[PDB]
Structure formats: C-alpha cells, structure tokens
C-alpha cells in the first residue's frame, strides 16, 4: 500500500486502489521501465464478472436481483456463443471508466462528462464514415468542443475487425521530400504513404489534412475524404509578434484519437475513436517544437532576434514560451476551446483529490501528467504518483498493416 | 529479457544488458510503478568480493596474482576483525563508481574527474570541520569549481557514527513567525530550529548562511561558524532588467551534499560529503521558484508588469525563464562555474552513448534527468531510460536523530 507524498503542501495519502490493479506492467523490483512509451473462455468470464460488479456498484444495486441475472446471463452467453453483448448503459459506463482509468491523461477531471455514441450496429466502411463525420460534427460544435466517443462493433470470433487506420481523425500529411527531408508532419509519413498507395492524390502543403482509411471486417481499407467544412482549423498568430502570422502555421481544433483499443469487461473494441479538447502544450511544445515534428523552435528564435549561438541565453525556452502564448491566443481568438497547462494541471490535482475520496487512489503516469515545459511550475510536478492498470481501459494496439 | 530502450528524436535502439547486475532491488512491481516517489553478519564478504572484482577488471588485471592476493586479504581481514579497510585506490575507484551509478545525476559525464580526500583517520568534530574546510576551499577554487568528495571514517559495529547533520555544507536559514510563514529558506526551517537550540544567534536575513552541526561518534553535535570568505556567494542580477538586483536575491557557489551515505564494497560511510557545480535550473527554478521554497515567481512577475490575473498569459513561464537567465548571467559574471540545462542534458546524452560502449547501458531515473523547465526542449526527454541500483552507490539515510 504505497504512501504518496505531495511536496508542495506536505500532504500524505495511501493509494489503496493500486492493490485492485489487474493487468501487470513492465516494471520489476530489478529495474523500472516507466519511461518506456510502449511497455480462452474462462478469463473472459472473470473480466466480465469484474466489470459487471463495477457497473452494479456504480448504480447502488450491488449484490441485488438484477446483479445476479446479469452475471448468469453473461456466463450462459459465453458458454453458448463464446462472447456476450454489453447493454447500452453498461457501455456508457465503460467508456467513462476507461477514460477515468487512463494514467497518461491529464484531462480526467472531465471523465463523467462524456458523450457516448453506440455504433455497434455498424455494418460497413460507408456507415463507419458517416458515424465519424457526425462524431466530428458534434464534438467540434463550432469551436465549443465537447467530449465524445463513438463505439464500433466489438471484436468477435469469425469476423475481422473494424479499424481506423489513422492514428487520429485529423492528421496533416507528411511527404518525404527529394533530399530525405519531410514536408508537413513527420509523425505521419507512413499513414501518408498508405493513403497515396490507396489512391489519394497527394497535396504538397505543410498542413494538408489527411483522408481517412477505414477498414470494415475482412475488407481492405477504403479511402474517405473529410469535407473541408467539417475540419475546423485555427491559423496561428501572435498577440504581440505580428511577423508570427507570416509563418503560415495552423493547427486543428479537434484532437480525436482513433487507433486505440477500448477494453470493457473482457470485450475488445479495436475501433472506438474518442475526442476532447487540446491542451496548449501538446500543440505549442510537442507538435510544433519537437525536433522530429515541425521543429520550428530555431526559426522562431531567429525571427525573435535571439542569440542562438550559445545555449545559456535560453533562446530555446524563450522562443518556446512565445509559441505557446501564440497557440493560446489564436485558439481563444478563433473561439475554439483550449486549456493551458497551468489550469489543466491545477484541475487535474482536483481530480486527484476527488479520486482519493471515491476509490482511494488514481492511476497516474507522472512523466505524462507533467507538461513538457514549466514542469515544476505546475503542482502535479510536486505530487508523487502511482502508475497501475485498471480495466476498463484504452490500450495501444498494433497498426493493421 | 534485455530491455529495449528507444530514443524518439532519432529512432535509434539500444539494449541495456547492464540492468542484469542490479543487486539491490527498487520499489516497482509488475502491479504498480513507484518511480516518481523520492524515498522508500558475514554477508559483507559477497559485497566485498564483487567490488574487488570490478576494480581489477577496470585495470585489465582480471585474474592475475595481485587479484587473487587482494581477495585473500579481505577474507582474512574480515575473518579476524569482522570488517575491513579499503586500499586507498579502491576507495578512489568506488567513490567514482558510486557517482557513475547515481541514477538521478545528470552531470555524470564528469564522473572520471573526482578528487577523493581521504579523511578515514578522522576523530572529533573539530577534525571534520577542517577536513570539510579544506574540501570547501579546494572545490570552490576562487570560483573555478572542481568536483570533490571527502570520505570520513567508515562505520563499524559498537562504534558511534560520523554524521553531518546539515543536508548540505551551505544552507540558508529559515525563520518562522508570529504568523508562521517563513523568512529565509523553508527547506531548512528544521535544521535552523536545531542550530538555534545548540546556541546559534539567529539573524534577520533571507540569505543567512547557517552554521554547521558536525557530530563525532558517540558524542553530541558541536556548532561551527563557517568563515565568510570560504562561503563564496553570487548576488543575483539580470542583464537587462536592472531592478532585478534590487530584489536582493543571492545564491551560493558550492553544491555540497553532506547527509548522504557512501556505500562501497559493503562498507558504509555515513559522512562522505560530495560537491561539484550547479546546474542553473536547480537554483533558479527549484530553489527560488518552488512554491515551498523561496517562491519568488509572483514577485518577479509583478516587477515585469505581467498579467498575473489569468494563467493563459504564461506569466509563470515568462518570469521563470528570466529568473534562470539572471542566475546564469550572475554566475558567469562572478566567474563561478555553472552550466545551463541545455548544455547539461546534451552532455548527459554523450554520457549514455559512452556508457553503452563501456558497460552496456546506464542507470538513469528519467524524472530527475529531465530538467524542471523546458523538458521536451532537451534531448533527454526523448530518450527512454532504465532505472536500477548498481553498487557502489550513494544511498539516502535516516536523519541522525
Ligand atoms: C477534454 C480534455 C482532454 C484533455 C485536456 C486531455 C489531455 C491529455 C494529454 C495532454 C494527454 C497526453 C498526450 C500525449 O501522449 O502526449 C492525454 C492522453 C490520453 N488521453 Fe486525454 N485529454 C482530454 C480528453 C480525453 C478523452 C475524452 C479521452 C477518452 C475518452 C482521453 C483519453 C486519453 C488517453 C487514453 C490517453 C493516453 C494515451 C497517450 O497519451 O498516449 N482524453 N490526454
Ligand atoms: C559536477 C557537476 C554535477 C552536476 C551539474 C550535477 C547535477 C545534479 C542534479 C541536477 C541532480 C538532480 C537531483 C535532485 O535535484 O534531487 C543530481 C543528483 C545527484 N547527484 Fe549530481 N551533479 C554533479 C556532480 C555530482 C557528484 C560529484 C556527485 C557525487 C560524487 C553527484 C551525486 C549525485 C547524487 C547521489 C544525486 C541524487 C541524490 C538526490 O538527488 O537526492 N553529483 N545531480
Ligand atoms: C482525447 C485527447 C485529448 C487531448 N487533449 N489530447 C489527446 C492526446 O492523446 C494522445 C496523443 C497521442 C500522440 C502523442 N504524441 C506526443 C505528443 C504527440 C497518442 C495517444 F495515444 C493519445 F491518446 C487526446
Ligand atoms: C553534487 C551535486 C551537484 C549538483 N549540481 N547538484 C546537486 C544536488 O543534489 C541533491 C540535491 C538535494 C536537494 C533537493 N532539492 C529539492 C529539489 C532540490 C538533495 C540531495 F540529496 C542531492 F543529492 C549535487
Ligand atoms: C521517452 C519519453 O519517456 C517519452 O518522450 C515520453 C515522456 N513523457 C511524455 N509526456 C507526454 N505528455 N507526452 C509524451 O509523448 C511523452 N513522451
Ligand atoms: C513527485 C516527484 O517525483 C518529485 O517531486 C521529484 C520529481 N523530479 C525531481 N527532479 C529534481 N531534479 N529534483 C526533485 O526534487 C524532483 N522531485
Ligand atoms: Cl496531438
Ligand atoms: Cl540545491
Ligand atoms: Gd510587435
Ligand atoms: Gd514600473
Ligand atoms: Zn517503475
């Protein structure tokens, strides 16, 4: 039962919830591997059993009549068909828990406010595209972003998987150039090659929005173009540095992760895209300044006429801070929801206290909760954390190709 | 079973085969990761044997004459007395290897340049004090800082204990009020409470260099007044915000860690203060800007006429970069050795590649190697790392009371 200290205030709690940790992680007492980014009918039953207990515990009918039937229904249905179907209420309850259990998510103060779309009756890549366009449309909401998840038909024996090949619903093309370089986003060179190979006529800008590659079961992926007027984008400008808009930088409003597997009570939904709103550092710091991403840091500092020959001038840090300022200003100007890493960490601390009262702890991967700049300026820096895996959960899964 | 370790800036891959040697066990289990937590008889022969076998390999004397010979003397030394004394070169070799194995030290590229003063024949606090004072004056070197460590007599059973009560050789006072809140450094409130109890006259400053509380075996502590000309300090000023000097800020030159316990070949030296030189973020970001330390961030932001009303202004981030610029600037002006976090982390990557070729890996705790500001702007953010306990080593130790 770990003792967890917060160093800002001095408080101490004990994460009793870590004992309920089911699936095991990559660390042992010999060696910690926390900083690594990427770490049968009877067991389907005990996961299903556990989830149904969870569900009924949340509705205050733990141990009741209905409880007994469900357990009995799920067993007899596994025995009969090898699997079982979630009810709608149980599905909504499991999308929410999966978010509440994501240790690398800082936005989890919002976990109970989640719009779940049941698309488990989906039938084709063409229906799949329609459900997605409506997800984007509802989540985006003209800049007043809302959290949503669309759940496509679960993995099941006999049929292939529904898969979204794109890591996110909105990605920018990454074209490998002549001289080995990359135009656009380098994290998406591969999805870009696949889209071309499947008949997408490429562009050559730095911010070409990628088509969707949508895989129906036992089917090749099919190419679908997003309507331009569905993808709300924000041009990036600086409140005081007016040469900044001459960079032509843009980002998109809607962060919608689309390649993660959703796990509920032993069942697996390999296509369940979810979306919220951005924190300024993900765009400002990571997407635009990462040396393997758009890598603008140098060009900004040169424009700012900072001294880039030496590092002790902290030109990197000065340029980066104004790149974030610009992201926050641009998004509020465009009236698109956005949260800065101070407010986001502040309110994640409020999540951490709400969680301690409710379950006795909270899965949190420190290295992902602390923002990529100004770490120790936020309060999550000084909070010790305990990293474990609870189910329901979003897990990574391999690329379908 | 050789952990795959990736660098995400470049995409390179290495395997840490050194992690297999981890004798002492850390705090993580497959159930939960505790990496972000700060803290948690003739077996002595096995520790002494393996340490000796390191030594002779490091001098290409694996399996020859003196190798077996020295092995015999340990066997016999312990057989007679129940403990043993280190050949002075082994003391030097283990002092350097403990530094080389410190997972949380980002300055380990300097590990081979360590001055080891041998204080093993010490008896009395007045004796320590001079061993300490020679260390301080050697390492400071009029501001040309030099890594040094002084090794006071190892612990043996039935004996007392050499302990330096201060967490560091140079610590600022912290004074409580008719309203509680601290003037000076709140991290040192306690040792200031002790220093006064043992008769020290309290000052009224926010940068009052504490006395020392040195303690010899089986004896109470003795206060020691450090000579002011030995405590080299740097007044803080900012190159272009001329009011910064007016704030009255200072920090000292010598980062000197007393209260940690050297552990070599099964011997335990509870008094073994080491020293090197500062990285600017330790001073500007941690010591001056932590909410539980001096916490000057809002004060500097007022003076910059920043909009502290909203957090999306990134006033915290802006003021912090300037506080760091002033620390770098001030140390460079005083001709005192200092290193910024971009220079430091880039030198630590040159360390990891060095260590790959040499020992097949390196133990590194990611959360302390990444700087407390601008983390993703430094290359070590993008480097996966593995944390484990090699020996020799510096360990945390309980307070001597
Ligand atoms: C609405 C505001 C939200 C904010 C501010 C937010 C913030 C973040 C951030 C900064 C990360 C780390 C990103 C990275 O890997 O660099 C993250 C990860 C994650 N988020 Fe959230 N998120 C939000 C909503 C959601 C929603 C609605 C879901 C699911 C329904 C979700 C699920 C996850 C998961 C599973 C991860 C871990 C995967 C990973 O980071 O690699 N988040 N979130
Ligand atoms: C020469 C320049 C050096 C630099 C720039 C440097 C820098 C750092 C920094 C920034 C930390 C962060 C840990 C924290 O903030 O708590 C650290 C930890 C540590 N360093 Fe170094 N260091 C240097 C030399 C040394 C030497 C000479 C030794 C011992 C021989 C040493 C041993 C350690 C240990 C044991 C820790 C972890 C203990 C702890 O942080 O509680 N370092 N160092
Ligand atoms: C719903 C939601 C809201 C929000 N605000 N942010 C996210 C980001 O989620 C993710 C981002 C990535 C890419 C991470 N790379 C490091 C920098 C880019 C991978 C994932 F698996 C995520 F889950 C998701
Ligand atoms: C030799 C050396 C060189 C260098 N440059 N820095 C150091 C600091 O090491 C340490 C710092 C602290 C204080 C921690 N404070 C809370 C946040 C800061 C405690 C330790 F136990 C250390 F070991 C040591
Ligand atoms: C290798 C390193 O652990 C990796 O870059 C991690 C560190 N922390 C992170 N934290 C967040 N929020 N997002 C990330 O992508 C990462 N990357
Ligand atoms: C909770 C967290 O692990 C803890 O505050 C650590 C994080 N990283 C740190 N890094 C350094 N250099 N110094 C520290 O005190 C800490 N504190
Ligand atoms: Cl993103
Ligand atoms: Cl310090
Ligand atoms: Gd301007
Ligand atoms: Gd003024
Ligand atoms: Zn761990």
B336 CB neighbours in chain A (<8 A) are none
Nearest to B249 by CA among B210, B283, B290, B292: B283
Catalytic residue among B99, B155, B171, B282: B282
Rounded Cα distance, B154 and B168, in Å: 19
A374 CB neighbours in chain B (<8 A) are 314, 316-317, 320, 373-374
Contact by Cβ (8 Å): A179, A311: no
Residue B50 resides in a domain: yes
Rounded Cα distance, B336 and B232, in Å: 9
What domain count does chain B have?
A: 3
Separation in Å, CA A367 to CA A138, A216, A370, B348? 32, 36, 6, 19
Residue B216 resides in a domain: yes
B241 in the same domain as B189:
no
Which stretches of A126-255 are assigned E, i.e. beta strand?
Answer: 148-151, 163-164, 174-176, 182-184, 212-215, 222-224, 233-235, 250-252
**Pairing relationship of beta strands B148-151 and B115-118 according to DSSP bridges:** parallel
A265 in the same domain as A296:
no
Closest CB from A15, A332, A367 relative to B366 = A367
A331 in the same domain as A362:
no
| CATH code of B287's domain | 3.90.1230.10
Contact by Cβ (8 Å): B125, B161: no
Residue A182 resides in a domain: yes
Alpha helices for A119-244 (secondary structure H): 125-140, 189-197
Alpha helices for B59-166 (secondary structure H): 66-81, 88-101, 125-140
Resolution of this structure in Å: 2.2
**Pairing relationship of beta strands A174-176 and A163-164 according to DSSP bridges:** unpaired
| Pairwise CB contact (< 8 Å): A297 & B377 | yes
Contact by Cβ (8 Å): A196, A190: no
Contact by Cβ (8 Å): B207, B250: yes
Which stretches of B209-348 are assigned E, i.e. beta strand?
Answer: 212-215, 222-224, 233-235, 250-252, 256-257, 261-264, 267-269, 274-275
Residue A3 resides in a domain: no
Rounded Cα distance, B370 and B216, in Å: 38
B245 in the same domain as B265:
no
Rounded Cα distance, B133 and B164, in Å: 13
B358-361 CB contacts, 8 Å cutoff, 24+ apart: B359/B18, B360/B15, B360/B16, B360/B17, B360/B18, B361/B5, B361/B14, B361/B15, B361/B16, B361/B17, B361/B18, B361/B19, B361/B386
Nearest to B272 by CA among B80, B401, B86: B86
B251 in the same domain as B216:
no
| CATH code of A128's domain | 3.90.440.10
Separation in Å, CA B240 to CA A65, A316, A355, B322? 74, 18, 46, 10
If 0-12 CB within 10 Å is exposed, 13-18 middle and 19+ buried, where does residue B176 land?
middle
Distance A365 CA to ligand 1 centre (A): 12
Q: Encoding tokens for residue B51? A: 């340490």
Count of alpha carbons within 13 angstroms of residue B391, beta-carbon side: 21
Rounded Cα distance, A140 and A401, in Å: 30
Distance B236 CA to ligand 6 centre (A): 24
Structural domain range at position B212? 121-146+161-232+396-400
Binding site for Zn(2+): residue ranges of A?
A: 27, 32
B320 labeled part of a ligand binding site:
no
Nearest to B86 by CA among B119, B132, B130, B124: B119
Nearest protein Cα to ligand 2, atom 9? B105
A335 in the same domain as A239:
yes
Number of Cβ within 10 Å of residue A231's Cβ equals 15
Q: Encoding tokens for residue A42? A: 């009877």
Question: Is B31 considered catalytic here?
Answer: no
Separation in Å, CA B100 to CA B97, B154, B351? 5, 21, 10
Residue owning tokens 């590649």: B353
B151 in the same domain as B267:
yes
Rounded Cα distance, B34 and B39, in Å: 10
| Pairwise CB contact (< 8 Å): A18 & B31 | yes
A75 in the same domain as A167:
no
Question: Is B90 considered catalytic here?
Answer: no
What Rg do the C-alpha atoms of chain A give, in angstroms? 22
A193 in the same domain as A114:
no
Number of Cβ within 10 Å of residue A78's Cβ equals 17
- Phi and psi torsions of A6, nearest 5°: -105, 125
Phi-psi region of A218 (alpha: psi -120 to 50; beta: other; left: phi over 0): left
What Rg do the C-alpha atoms of chain B give, in angstroms? 23
| CATH code of B365's domain | 3.90.340.10
Residues 6+ apart with CB under 8 A from B352: B362, B364, B383
Q: B136: distance to nearest CA of chain A, Å?
A: 26
Per DSSP, B169 falls in state: S
Q: What angle do CA A292, A295, A301 make, to 5 degrees?
A: 150
- Phi and psi torsions of A238, nearest 5°: -110, 140
Per DSSP, A247 falls in state: G
Element (H, E) at B289: helix B288-289
Question: Which experiment gave this structure?
Answer: X-ray
Residue B378 resides in a domain: no
Rounded Cα distance, B139 and B337, in Å: 11
Residue A178 resides in a domain: yes
Nearest ligand to residue B171 Cα: 8
Distance A268 CA to ligand 3 centre (A): 20
Q: Encoding tokens for residue B285? A: 């970001």
Nearest protein Cα to ligand 5, atom 12? A368
Residue A378 resides in a domain: no
Nearest ligand to residue A367 Cα: 5
B381 labeled part of a ligand binding site:
yes
Residue B65 resides in a domain: yes
B126 in the same domain as B212:
yes
B126 in the same domain as B50:
no
Nearest to B356 by CA among B9, B104, B10, B12: B12
Separation in Å, CA A285 to CA A57, A106, A344? 41, 16, 15
Q: Residues with Cβ within 6 A of ligand 2?
A: B 99, 102, 104-107, 110, 114, 147, 149, 260, 274, 276-277, 279, 282, 339, 344, 368, 394
Contact by Cβ (8 Å): A214, A274: no
A136 in the same domain as A218:
yes
């Amino acid at each position: 039962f770990p003792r967890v200290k917060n160093w800002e205030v001095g408080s101490i709690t004990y994460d009793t919830l870590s004992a309920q940790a089911q699936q095991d992680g990559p660390c042992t007492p010999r060696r910690c591997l926390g900083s690594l980014v990427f770490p049968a009918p009877e067991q389907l039953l005990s996961q299903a059993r556990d989830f149904i207990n969870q569900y009924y515990s949340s509705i205050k009918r733990s141990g009741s009549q209905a409880h007994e039937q469900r357990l009995q229904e799920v067993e007899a249905e596994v025995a009969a068909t090898g699997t079982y179907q979630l009810r709608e209420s149980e599905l909504v309850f499991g999308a929410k828990q999966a978010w509440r259990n994501a240790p690398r998510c800082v936005g989890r103060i919002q976990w109970g406010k989640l719009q779940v779309f049941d698309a488990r009756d989906c039938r084709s890549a063409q229906e799949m595209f329609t459900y997605i366009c409506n997800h984007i449309k509802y989540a985006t909401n003209r800049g007043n972003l809302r959290s949503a998840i669309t759940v496509f038909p679960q993995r099941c024996p006999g049929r292939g998987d529904f898969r979204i090949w794109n890591s996110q619903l909105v990605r920018y093309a990454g074209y490998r150039q002549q001289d080995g370089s990359v135009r656009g986003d380098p994290a998406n060179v591969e999805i870009t090659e696949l889209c071309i190979q499947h008949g997408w006529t490429p562009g050559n800008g730095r911010f070409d929005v990628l088509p969707l590659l949508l895989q129906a079961p036992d089917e090749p992926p099919e190419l679908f173009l997003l309507p331009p007027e569905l993808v709300l984008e924000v041009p990036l400008e600086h409140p005081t540095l007016e040469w900044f808009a001459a960079l032509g930088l843009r980002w998109y409003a809607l962060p919608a992760v689309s390649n993660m597997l959703l796990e509920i009570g032993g069942l697996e939904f390999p296509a369940a895209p979810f979306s919220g709103w951005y924190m300024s550092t993900e765009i400002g710091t990571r997407n635009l300044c990462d040396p393997h991403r758009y890598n603008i840091l140098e060009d900004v500092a040169v424009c700012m006429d900072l001294d880039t020959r030496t590092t002790s001038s902290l030109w990197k840090d000065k340029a980066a801070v104004e790149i974030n300022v610009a992201v926050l200003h641009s998004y509020q100007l465009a009236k698109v929801t956005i949260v800065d890493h101070h407010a986001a960490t502040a309110s994640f601390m409020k999540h951490l206290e709400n969680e301690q009262k409710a379950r006795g702890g909270c899965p949190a991967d420190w290295a992902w909760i602390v923002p990529p700049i100004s770490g120790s300026l936020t309060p999550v820096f000084h909070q010790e954390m305990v990293n474990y895996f609870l189910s329901p959960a979003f897990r990574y899964q391999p690329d379908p190709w």
